[PDB]
Write a protein that binds this ligand. Structure first.
Ligand SMILES: *[C@H](O)[C@H](C[C@@H]1CCNC1=O)NC(=O)[C@@H]1C[C@H](OC)CN1C(=O)[C@@H](NC(=O)OC(C)(C)C)C(C)C
Ligand SMILES: *[C@H](O)[C@H](C[C@@H]1CCNC1=O)NC(=O)[C@@H]1C[C@H](OC)CN1C(=O)[C@@H](NC(=O)OC(C)(C)C)C(C)C
Ligand SMILES: [Cl-]
Ligand SMILES: [Cl-]
Ligand code: NA
Ligand code: NA
Lengths: 301, 306
C-alpha cells in the first residue's frame, strides 16, 4: 500500500548523458549508438537569439566546433545534421551503454520521468505530465537543456521529451526526439506565452480510483451523472472534457473497485463543489492530475 | 525555476539489486562486493510466521537453500550469517558494479530516495522522509522487501534503509543496513502500530524558503518571533521543536532571501493559526515537510552526481 509520485529508475538514461559545448554555450546531449542528440539552439550566438537562421548557422560549423564530453572522455564529432529543432552529432564511437530504446511523441495528459542534468551529469529524477497547454511543470536551471523525459515500461526506454526553454510563468517547453516542439513554441527569443492551462480530468479520476484501492471512501456518494452533464460542470472549473475514450480507459479501475466511471464522476463533481473540508486524499489537499490510469495500475498492482 | 519532489539518480544502486529466494519466499537483496544483504525474515515460513526464533532457524539452513539471481545469472552462496535483522549471504563473485558506498543510519526528518524493486528488478524511484515516528510513507507491495533507500554525496552512495514491513495504517518499517530497525518495531507477526506522528518543522521552513526562491511570497509578513515563543506554537500544532542548530542550518537560505528564520517562523505561525485562505504554496494546499534544507539548496543550485 501507499501511493507516491514514482519515477522510473534512471540508470539506463544516465549512461547516455553527455556534455555538448559550442561557442560559449554548454548543455546536455543524449548519446545513443554513434549519435548525440541535443537542442539546436546550442549554436546560437548572443548577437542572434531573436531570429536565428539555424540552417545558415549550422553550415558554417566544422565538426571540431562541437566539443562533446562523456565523463572524462572527449568524443570526436565526425558529422552533423539538423532534424527540426534537434541537432544530431555523429561521433566516432558508439555508446556501449546504449539501452533498448525508441522515440515516442506523447499526447497531453501523459506522464514521464525527467532526469535533470547539468554539464552531462545527473542531478535528480522526477515525474512530470504533458499539460493540456503543451508545457511541463519542471525543475530546470541554466544548463539543463538537453535533459530528457522518458518512460521504461518493460525493458525499453521510450524517450518522449528533450528540454529547450523556460517560459515567463516558470513552466517549460521542449521537443520530442525528432525535434518537433510540443505546442506552438519556437526556439527563438520572440515573445511567447503558454495558453491557459486546464486540469487533466481523466487523471484526477484515475487518482480517485487509486485512493479507493488504498482504502479511502469518504468522498464517494450515492449519485451518478450523465457524461455530458459532467462535462458541462467540469468545464466551469477549467477541467478538460472527459471523452468516451477516457471512460473506456478507466474501465479496468472501475471493475477492480466496483465503482462505475460515471459514479466516480459524480464524486468529482461534489469535490469540486465542496472541497475537502479539512480532509486529504492520498496525502494531498488538492485534486492531483499527474497520475494516469496506466500509472495507477502500474503502482497499485 | 520550478521545484519538484526530486529523487537521486538511481543508476549506481540499480546495478546492486538481485533476487533472493528461500523456500517459497522471494524478495530483493543488495549485492555489494561479495556479500548480498537481505531481510532475515526471508527464512520464515507460513507455519512459523508468528514468533520465529531466527538464531535457530538459520542453522537448519545451508548455502544452497538460498537462490540468488543477478538478472539471469545465478550467484553461488558460499556462506551465510545474520547481523541483527539482516542476513548476509557471502557469494563467490564480487559485484563488478559495486559503487563507492557506505552504510549510514539516518535521523528522523532526514530524506532519502527509495528504489522500489520486485524480483530483483528495479521498478520505481521516489523520495521519502524518515518520519518522527520512525516510519516511512512508502509505496510498497508484496515482494518489495529488500528494496533500499539511499542518498548520494559527490560520488559515494550512502545506504540508509532496507524495507521489511507494512504496518496497519499502510506506512512502512525497515532497518538500516546493519539490520537495526528504525523505530520500536520487530520482524514478526505480533501486534504493532505506528505511533502518533508530528510534522518536521525545519523541513517546512526549508520548503517555505524554496517557495520564496520560486516567487511565492504571499505568506510573508512584517513580523518576527523568538525561538521560545514559536516552539510553544509548534508544540500546540504537533510540530517538532525547532532548535538553534536548525536555525543555523537554514542560515544560507535566510541570507539569500532576506527572510530571517524567526521572520519565517512568524509566517509559519500565522499559517498554522489561520490557514492558507484558499491559496497554495508551490502547488500544495498543505505544508510540505519532506524537503530538508540541503534538499532545497541542492535542487535550487543544480548539484550533480559523479
Ligand atoms: C538551456 O539550458 C536553457 C534552459 C532554461 C534556462 C533557465 N531555465 C531553463 O529551463 N534554455 C535557454 O536558455 C533557452 C534558449 C533560448 O534562446 C535561444 C532562451 N531560452 C530560455 O529558456 C529563455 N526563455 C525565453 O527566452 O523565453 C521567451 C521566448 C518566452 C522570451 C529563458 C532563459 C528566459
Ligand atoms: C516483503 O516483501 C513484505 C512487504 C510488504 C507486503 C505488503 N507491503 C509491504 O510493504 N513484507 C512482509 O510480508 C512482512 C513479513 C512479515 O512476516 C514475517 C509480515 N509482513 C508484513 O509486512 C505484514 N505486516 C504485518 O504483519 O504487520 C503486523 C506485524 C502489524 C501484523 C503485511 C503483509 C500485513
Ligand atoms: Cl514583530
Ligand atoms: Cl496539497
Ligand atoms: Na516523432
Ligand atoms: Na515575518
Amino acid at each position: 500500500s501507499g501511493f507516491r509520485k514514482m519515477a522510473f529508475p534512471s540508470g539506463k538514461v544516465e549512461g547516455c548523458m553527455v556534455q555538448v559545448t559550442c561557442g560559449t554555450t554548454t548543455l546536455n546531449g543524449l548519446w545513443l549508438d554513434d549519435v548525440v542528440y541535443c537542442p539546436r539552439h546550442v549554436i546560437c550566438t548572443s548577437e542572434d537569439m531573436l531570429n536565428p537562421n539555424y540552417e545558415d548557422l549550422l553550415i558554417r560549423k566544422s565538426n571540431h566546433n562541437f566539443l562533446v564530453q562523456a565523463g572524462n572522455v572527449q568524443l570526436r564529432v565526425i558529422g552533423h545534421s539538423m532534424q527540426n529543432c534537434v541537432l544530431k552529432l555523429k561521433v566516432d564511437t558508439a555508446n556501449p551503454k546504449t539501452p533498448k530504446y525508441k522515440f515516442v511523441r506523447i499526447q497531453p495528459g501523459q506522464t514521464f520521468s525527467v532526469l535533470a542534468c547539468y554539464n552531462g551529469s545527473p542531478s535528480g529524477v522526477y515525474q512530470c505530465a504533458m499539460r493540456p497547454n503543451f508545457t511541463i511543470k519542471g525543475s530546470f536551471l541554466n544548463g539543463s537543456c538537453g535533459s530528457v523525459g522518458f518512460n521504461i515500461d518493460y525493458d525499453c526506454v521510450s524517450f518522449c521529451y528533450m528540454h529547450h526553454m523556460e517560459l515567463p510563468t516558470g513552466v517549460h517547453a521542449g521537443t520530442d526526439l525528432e525535434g518537433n516542439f510540443y505546442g506552438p513554441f519556437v526556439d527563438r527569443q520572440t515573445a511567447q506565452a503558454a495558453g491557459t492551462d486546464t486540469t487533466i480530468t481523466v487523471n484526477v479520476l484515475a487518482w480517485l480510483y487509486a485512493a479507493v484501492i488504498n482504502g479511502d471512501r469518504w468522498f464517494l456518494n450515492r449519485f451518478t451523472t450523465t457524461l455530458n452533464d459532467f462535462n458541462l460542470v467540469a468545464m466551469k472549473y477549467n477541467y478538460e472534457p472527459l471523452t468516451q475514450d477516457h471512460v473506456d480507459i478507466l474501465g479496468p479501475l472501475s471493475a477492480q473497485t466496483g465503482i462505475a466511471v460515471l459514479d466516480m464522476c459524480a464524486s468529482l463533481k461534489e469535490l469540486l463543489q465542496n472541497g475537502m473540508n479539512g480532509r486529504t486524499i492520498l496525502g494531498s489537499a488538492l485534486l492531483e492530475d499527474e497520475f494516469t490510469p496506466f500509472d495507477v495500475v502500474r503502482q497499485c498492482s
